[PDB]
Design a binder for this molecule. Sequence first.
Ligand code: CLA
Ligand code: CLA
Ligand code: CLA
Ligand code: CLA
Ligand code: CLA
Ligand SMILES: CCCCCCCCCCCCO[C@H]1O[C@H](CO)[C@@H](O[C@H]2O[C@H](CO)[C@@H](O)[C@H](O)[C@H]2O)[C@H](O)[C@H]1O
Ligand SMILES: CCCCCCCCCCCCO[C@H]1O[C@H](CO)[C@@H](O[C@H]2O[C@H](CO)[C@@H](O)[C@H](O)[C@H]2O)[C@H](O)[C@H]1O
Lengths: 43, 69, 158, 80, 197, 74, 67
Amino acid sequence: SMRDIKTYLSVAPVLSTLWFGALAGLLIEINRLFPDALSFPFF
Amino acid sequence: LTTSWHAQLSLNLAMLGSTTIVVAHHMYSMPPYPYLATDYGTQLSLFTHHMWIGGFLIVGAAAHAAIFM
Amino acid sequence: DIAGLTPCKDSKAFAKREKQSVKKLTSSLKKYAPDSAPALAIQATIDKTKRRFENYGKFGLLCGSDGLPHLIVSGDQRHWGEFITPGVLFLYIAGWIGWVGRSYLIAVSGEKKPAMREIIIDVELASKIIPRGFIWPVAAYREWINGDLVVDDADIGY
Amino acid sequence: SHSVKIYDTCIGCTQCVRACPTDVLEMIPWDGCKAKQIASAPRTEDCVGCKRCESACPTDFLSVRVYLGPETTRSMALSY
Amino acid sequence: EVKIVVDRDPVKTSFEEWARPGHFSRTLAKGPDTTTWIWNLHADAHDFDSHTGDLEEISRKVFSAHFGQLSIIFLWLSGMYFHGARFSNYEAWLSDPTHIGPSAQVVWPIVGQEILNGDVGGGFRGIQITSGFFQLWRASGITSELQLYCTAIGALIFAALMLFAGWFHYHKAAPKLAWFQDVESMLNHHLAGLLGL
Amino acid sequence: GDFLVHHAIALGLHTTTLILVKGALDARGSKLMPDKKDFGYSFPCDGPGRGGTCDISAWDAFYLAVFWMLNTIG
Amino acid sequence: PPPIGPKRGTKVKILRRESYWYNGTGSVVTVDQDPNTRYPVVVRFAKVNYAGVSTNNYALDEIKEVV
Ligand code: CLA
Ligand code: CLA
Ligand code: CLA
Ligand code: CLA
Ligand code: CLA
Ligand SMILES: CCCCCCCCCCCCO[C@H]1O[C@H](CO)[C@@H](O[C@H]2O[C@H](CO)[C@@H](O)[C@H](O)[C@H]2O)[C@H](O)[C@H]1O
Ligand SMILES: CCCCCCCCCCCCO[C@H]1O[C@H](CO)[C@@H](O[C@H]2O[C@H](CO)[C@@H](O)[C@H](O)[C@H]2O)[C@H](O)[C@H]1O
């Protein structure tokens, strides 16, 4: 059921996998846009 | 041998593990594929890989024979 | 300058390293057709290398005798971009994560079997608490003032 | 020989006596608990020091305690 | 006699059990009191013999799990053939085996990892392989990337077939205990049908 | 390089001190073994009950700390 | 004769040093009325100890009533 599939998608390993995948994607895209940074130059 | 999965697993693991070591010994000395013998990296890799696999299977045989006992 | 170091925009060893890297890349580039994909990839790498060296030069970093950038973390106001500002960012993000975790643990402890909500997350509840990390420095400070952050030593026990 | 002691927090559940592998312990009448019995250790020259009795005890903290002592043929479980 | 006997619809396909970790164990189904529970859940997962003392149920579970392993192996082979067809220098290697290094893995250019795309020859840059797939493919008469694509597609279809067969032979039609204990017929089929043919 | 190696040496000092201090301050007892002082400085264990109690005495803490001492001095 | 000990459902605090739940709280289940019983108060806890037990017996001078 929708209730049961929503319950199964909330278990700890599945949620960890999704969270870390999204975070890794964000970090990869940021490093593709502003590469080779050793400091904060904006201000 | 018709009522215990563990005993069958023990015997079969031992046989497959020993067979893999035989395969590793025979494939270096009678290279069956073209342009394999002079690709030194591939030969070394195949020999080492199948040695490791056979060792692990042989150990598993003892584990599951103990489970039977 | 500071500690006998030299700015990277005026260092001969820095420019030597840049030239050596570019020459090493160009030697590989000279092996393929001009319009092939490997040639374009190597050219993109060369442009990226030049951009990296230029940005390091013009962002005010200091270079040692080896010709490599060195970081200053003593508090000097000419180098806050190296440690202090990113450090503030790290502390802000870490405080957000910790604050939302603690608030979830406190909100969930009132149930009949709280442990069941620790291996299976209540996403509906967590989605109302996640946005509140935005102002964690204010909430934590006010909680500390009113004596809601800490438990007395006499009350600690299994 | 090892030393075995019984303390007055015993509830007379008899699990330690059932767990012992060389018959060291036994139950005797008592009036201090609802079960009207308590454990006893009269044959500690046959103790090997395995501590199964401690594993079986349900009270917190334990009501039966084993202190290892000087070793003998019986306490080292030597068949030769 | 040696006859094909099964039971129809033994287990109902439902999502109820997926929401109850530890369902297979009577001592794990309660829920956790300590962290140890979590470790136990993974340690006792495939120990079917301890779940129950019924031989037939153990045999049925074993059969279904073996089908699952075959599905995974087919996925692995499909991946190998597709990567050989799409991201390799096999065609160039066919014309100069002694001077070109085989390669079938390439990487994306981020954080400087593209240096791992080495100069292996034949106008190609990548990671050199030692599994020996190129020699096996040459010994099979393969000369084109389209053939490798077709083999990869076939392997994907076979993986789907194995997974569906696992589902069917567990949840729909499960063989009886007498079916598994026909060792004479199993030996006859696996000596002659499998190895000989 | 001197900066990095000095912070490594500091790590060694702090961890060795942790091991030895935990050994000393828990010698008389803890939650897992509240009556430890009756058994003396060096004893094998307290058996497999209560989850298992391997390496629970203070002598064992000294034994563990000697490895970290050798690492740090190395 | 007056019944001894706190009533059922009372929240109590543990004072026995060697207990797992020392300085914690628990709920009274029952009190034994036999004058010969040395540890008559039965207490139940939310968390299990290292042996997996969640109930224990105590004397009247080892527990304090918390309101
Ligand atoms: C403790 C160890 C450590 C540290 C401190 C670093 C630090 C760094 N590494 Mg290294 N690294 C490490 C371990 C470490 N590394 C390890 C173990 C490995 C091997 C796995 C690597 C492999 C590695 C590689 C391959 C690379 C680095 C790079 C970097 C740099 C990344 C900078 C960046 O991406 O900025 C940009 C990122 C951010 C600003 C993060 C933003 C995070 C979120 C989105 C912020 C959102 C804020 C939000 C808007 C709220 C604020 C607003 C407010 C008003 C509310 C940095 C100097 C990269 C580099 O360029 O080095 C020079 C690089 O190429 N590292
Ligand atoms: C056909 C092969 C086969 C099969 C079907 C089984 C089946 C079984 N074995 Mg046996 N076994 C085998 C081979 C096999 N074994 C071999 C080769 C060995 C020798 C090493 C053993 C040694 C062995 C032992 C010692 C035990 C079993 C047990 C078991 C049972 C439970 C397994 C379980 O739940 O694992 C669950 C699986 C895990 C918790 C994950 C294990 C992951 C491993 C340890 C590491 C993998 C690392 C990977 C290669 C690299 C990743 C790196 C990356 C993540 C960074 C089950 C009946 C256990 C039992 O109780 O039997 C009654 C048991 O105690 N087996
Ligand atoms: C809610 C999360 C949380 C919070 C607020 C704290 C807070 C604290 N921990 Mg703890 N810790 C946590 C989780 C947390 N911990 C977990 C999951 C572990 C298991 C690995 C530990 C293991 C641990 C150790 C071993 C130690 C601490 C220590 C500390 C203290 C100093 C900070 C430190 O060293 O952190 C370091 C901790 C980590 C790097 C562990 C990872 C923390 C994760 C990222 C927290 C968030 C994860 C969580 C699943 C998020 C849920 C979100 C929610 C909306 C559902 C501080 C009281 C230290 C102490 O005692 O200082 C006096 C100490 O020695 N923690
Ligand atoms: C169509 C989907 C479906 C559904 C809804 C169910 C539902 C059910 N099945 Mg059935 N089953 C299915 C398909 C399905 N099954 C298939 C395709 C097979 C053949 C393999 C089986 C074989 C099977 C068996 C043998 C058993 C069940 C059982 C169950 C019950 C518990 C399931 C559970 O705990 O899942 C949650 C479990 C998982 C998600 C485990 C993961 C499984 C995947 C395939 C493993 C992947 C491994 C991974 C790739 C390795 C690498 C990891 C990493 C290192 C990269 C439940 C009634 C059990 C039952 O009825 O017990 C009384 C039982 O014993 N099923
Ligand atoms: C000639 C007939 C025949 C063939 C070809 C096979 C083939 C196989 N059997 Mg055996 N089996 C047979 C008859 C046969 N069996 C009979 C008569 C019985 C009853 C006594 C059994 C009972 C039996 C059991 C209990 C098990 C096997 C298993 C296996 C597999 C062993 C692993 C392997 O080498 O995979 C090599 C892989 C391949 C060659 C690729 C797959 C190719 C397809 C899928 C082969 C399909 C064969 C099958 C007979 C088709 C029937 C279709 C029809 C019902 C519509 C393998 C697929 C084991 C297994 O893993 O099962 C899943 C297993 O546990 N068999
Ligand atoms: C716990 C105990 C902590 C003790 C911390 C003590 C910190 C003392 C810091 C004193 C800093 C005084 O300032 C010292 O650094 C400044 C850079 O940051 C220098 O400033 C320099 O760079 C500035 C950049 O805007 C220029 O405007 C100045 O003309 C130039 O001199 C000062 O010339 C120097 O005197
Ligand atoms: C550069 C930075 C300089 C900062 C200077 C200002 C510092 C201000 C410190 C405020 C401390 C607030 O917290 C401090 O008092 C609280 C009471 O008010 C204490 O709270 C304690 O007493 C309260 C009753 O008064 C109880 O309700 C709490 O349960 C108890 O924990 C905190 O345990 C203590 O840490």
